[PDB]
């Protein structure tokens, strides 16, 4: 379930969108944290192995637990030309 991925920034950005964070509308009901809600199909994050629904645990070694949305966005924008992402990925979802 845990993966470390490295995304090479391009002109368009990192090729992801994020949702969630403390005080924001959650990405899913049972978790208020930061999630990758969109991955550009032909983009840098997709190439690095990022997938939709990944929970974003760290950016360049900094933990996002308890983080607000705005601070997570800033971390990604300020992460440089290569961005290390640590994620939690569900193999399957129980319903």
UniProtKB/Swiss-Prot annotation:
Tissue expression pattern: Expressed in kidney, skeletal muscles, liver, lung, breast, intestine, placenta and skin mainly in epithelial cells (at protein level).
- PDZ domain: residues covered: 4-91
Where Phosphoserine occurs, residue numbers?
A: 40
Q: Where in the cell is it found?
A: Cell membrane; Cell junction; Cell junction, Adherens junction; Cell projection, Lamellipodium
Write out the PTM section of this UniProt entry: Ubiquitinated; targeted for UBE3A-dependent multiubiquitination in the presence of high-risk HPV E6 proteins and degraded.
Family membership: Belongs to the LAP (LRR and PDZ) protein family.
Please give the clinical condition linked to this protein: Neural tube defects: Congenital malformations of the central nervous system and adjacent structures related to defective neural tube closure during the first trimester of pregnancy. Failure of neural tube closure can occur at any level of the embryonic axis. Common NTD forms include anencephaly, myelomeningocele and spina bifida, which result from the failure of fusion in the cranial and spinal region of the neural tube. NTDs have a multifactorial etiology encompassing both genetic and environmental components.
Q: How does it assemble?
A: Interacts with UBE3A. Interacts with PAK1 and PAK2. Interacts (via PDZ domains) with VANGL2. Interacts (via PDZ domains) with LPP and TRIP6; the interaction is direct. Interacts (via PDZ domains) with TJP2. Interacts (via PDZ domains) with APC; may mediate APC targeting to adherens junctions of epithelial cells. Interacts (via PDZ domains) with TSHR; regulates TSHR trafficking and function. Interacts with ARHGEF7 and GIT1; interacts directly with ARHGEF7. Interacts with CTNNB1. Interacts with MAPK12. Interacts (via PDZ domains 1 and 3) with MCC. Interacts with DLG5. (Microbial infection) Interacts (via fourth PDZ domain) with tick-borne encephalitis virus RNA-directed RNA polymerase NS5; this interaction targets viral NS5 to the cell membrane periphery and nucleus and prevents STAT1 phosphorylation, and thus, the activation of the JAK-STAT signaling pathway. Interacts with HPV E6. Interacts with influenza A virus protein NS1; the interaction results in the translocation of SCRIB from the cell membrane to perinuclear puncta.
Question: Briefly, what is this protein's role?
Answer: Scaffold protein involved in different aspects of polarized cell differentiation regulating epithelial and neuronal morphogenesis and T-cell polarization. Via its interaction with CRTAM, required for the late phase polarization of a subset of CD4+ T-cells, which in turn regulates TCR-mediated proliferation and IFNG and IL22 production. Plays a role in cell directional movement, cell orientation, cell sheet organization and Golgi complex polarization at the cell migration front. Promotes epithelial cell layer barrier function via maintaining cell-cell adhesion.
Record's protein name: Protein scribble homolog
* Protein encoded by which gene: SCRIB
Q: Which part of the entire sequence is included in the shown chain?
A: 725 to 815 of 1655
């Amino acid at each position: 379930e845990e993966l470390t991925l490295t995304i090479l920034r391009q002109t368009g950005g990192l090729g992801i969108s994020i949702a969630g964070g403390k005080g924001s509308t959650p990405y899913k009901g049972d978790d208020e944290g930061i999630f990758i809600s969109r991955v550009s199909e032909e983009g840098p994050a997709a190439r690095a192995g990022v997938r939709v629904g990944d929970k974003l645990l760290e950016v360049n070694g900094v933990a996002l637990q308890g983080a607000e949305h705005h601070e997570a966005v800033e971390a990604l924008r300020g992460a440089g030309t290569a961005v290390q992402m640590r994620v939690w990925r569900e193999r399957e979802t129980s319903v």
